[PDB]
Design a protein around this ligand. Structure first.
Ligand SMILES: CS(=O)(=O)Nc1ccc(C(=O)NCc2ccc(Cl)cc2Cl)cc1
Ligand SMILES: CS(=O)(=O)Nc1ccc(C(=O)NCc2ccc(Cl)cc2Cl)cc1
Ligand SMILES: CCCCCCCCCCCC
Ligand SMILES: CCCCCCCCCCCC
Ligand SMILES: CCCCCCCCCCCC
Ligand SMILES: CCCCCCCCCCCC
Ligand SMILES: CCCCCC
Ligand SMILES: [K+]
Ligand SMILES: [K+]
Ligand SMILES: [K+]
Ligand SMILES: [K+]
Ligand SMILES: [K+]
Lengths: 263, 271
């Protein structure tokens, strides 16, 4: 009985609408500075040619072409290739380093298809464990005072969760990495959400520390990822609630509009 | 709590397995990428010397000054067309909510960054429902098709399940990897390997960004990008399943080899 109707259609449109709203807000937020920068870089070239007429346009385009090539590629060392494998199985894939060989690519393909499932188990376990650790913290002392206390518990969850997994590591990145108060939190979310643009990596900037920072960051990821995995899932539940509430509020409006128009 | 010990024992064992898996991976990439790295790290210095010595003009020490300005301008990919125009920003939000995050173009304003955080915090869960719905919808289209082809093989229960999964992977690779990779090769002027490498890096949601179905503004036929969206939307759902299956196989191989080691340890070849 094919009553199994396509509910996806509604969601699809909401997503399409969500992208349109996004695209516009990003255009309005980034296209301005793109222009200012697009002009300041033109002012920098002309400054270069004149301040150093010793290099001509024809010798400048060669320079700029060779550096875009050098762009294509200290790396792949003892530990760099180790984090590369980290961004593969985690799917964060910052991309600051990526294979350039046909073999590295193929191996990355296989290394990922087998790596991501495996890491999922680890992350799954780490989650359940961290989910029980809070199972030793939340319900026990939160019962000191049906769905009314649940809201304080969840607030306690996200609040500390942001402190341990977002606040503190952001503060540490701010000092150690030399990032903005915002840039740090930006990195945390872009990373722990697995987005991983790669615009900010917690290990670029050739080298400053040793032996007490990258291990913490790594295990930060191992646990932070599990934390957002839970967080994102709640936001998914929240949205599911809001959807049905808005579904019933719509039938609410219609009932009155109809019950009114009948007059 | 009697189970809390055993679950912790499995997590710890899996973590250690993960550590070893990273170690074997890093070693294989290092051994296969660092050579070309050093080959290029020396030829780029050869070019600098050819540049510095041919005209070590007063700015010879101010050279790295320039290279810092263009590398910084590189992150914005300056062309010494807008990358935040109507459509490009639309593709950006797509790279955000799908967590592909190619990163080639990312926000630079505090406002852009703060909205991007909120946008992902809300967008990721949202897109998850769509991808689920797409998964289910595509799953029932294979259920309608798997019934026709499993009854032609029922001419003669626990063994036909393998024939079904094979045809899945087969049509899966065909529609979602083979065809699109081909189109990427022709249009994007990519190699046979780069296209598949792209498809895998993209649909596994890793998204290095070294390759992008529109990263270059080349000429882009008027329906190219829409078709690619649909590819992404159904390609991601496909790999979600394939990845989910590979996990099962791992767990099968995992717990089957676990007993094989106890098997081994017990006998030890009669000793
Ligand atoms: C710039 S470099 O690539 O050439 N050098 C390296 C730089 C950093 C790291 C590293 O371990 N960073 C911590 C980390 C670990 C795993 C994951 Cl997924 C994400 C992060 Cl941020 C390794 C090599
Ligand atoms: C380099 S550019 O940014 O300045 N120009 C653009 C380049 C490409 C695209 C585009 O549509 N690519 C297909 C696509 C679509 C959605 C998703 Cl999630 C991923 C992908 Cl690969 C748009 C603008
Ligand atoms: C040009 C053909 C490249 C083939 C690489 C695909 C390897 C897939 C192996 C899957 C093992 C899990
Ligand atoms: C900040 C805006 C939060 C609301 C996001 C849109 C959720 C609407 C769901 C409607 C489901 C039909
Ligand atoms: C920001 C995304 C949309 C904001 C809320 C509007 C959604 C209304 C959907 C109506 C479905 C009944
Ligand atoms: C194949 C990559 C390395 C994993 C193979 C062996 C892992 C540990 C052996 C089993 C331990 C019980
Ligand atoms: C063409 C090879 C595809 C492999 C997907 C499992
Ligand atoms: K994931
Ligand atoms: K991801
Ligand atoms: K990613
Ligand atoms: K990424
Ligand atoms: K990236």
């Amino acid at each position: 009985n094919v009553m199994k109707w396509k509910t996806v259609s509604t969601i699809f449109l909401v997503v399409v609408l969500y992208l349109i709203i996004g695209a516009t807000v990003f255009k309005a937020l980034e296209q301005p500075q793109e222009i200012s920068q697009r002009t300041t870089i033109v002012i920098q070239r002309e400054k270069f040619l004149r301040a150093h007429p010793c290099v001509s346009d024809q010798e400048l385009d060669e320079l700029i072409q060779q550096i875009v090539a050098a762009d294509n590629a200290s790396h792949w060392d003892l530990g760099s290739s180790f984090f590369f494998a980290g961004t593969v199985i985690t799917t964060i894939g910052f991309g600051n380093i990526s294979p350039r060989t046909e073999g590295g690519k193929i191996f990355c393909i296989i290394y990922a298809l087998l790596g991501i499932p495996l890491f999922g188990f680890l992350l799954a376990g780490v989650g359940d464990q961290l989910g029980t650790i809070f199972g030793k913290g939340i319900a026990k002392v939160e019962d000191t005072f049906q769905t009314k206390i649940r809201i304080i518990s969840t607030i306690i969850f996200i609040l500390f969760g942001c402190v341990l997994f977002v606040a503190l590591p952001a503060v540490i990145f701010k000092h150690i990495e030399g990032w903005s108060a915002l840039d740090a939190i930006y990195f945390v979310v872009i990373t722990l959400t697995t987005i991983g643009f790669g615009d900010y990596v917690a290990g670029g900037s050739d080298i400053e520390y040793l032996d007490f920072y990258k291990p913490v960051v790594w295990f930060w990821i191992l646990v932070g990822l599990a934390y957002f995995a839970a967080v994102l899932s709640m936001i998914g539940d929240w949205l599911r609630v809001i959807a049905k509430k808005t579904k019933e509020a719509v039938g609410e409006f219609r009932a009155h509009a109809a019950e009114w128009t009948a007059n």
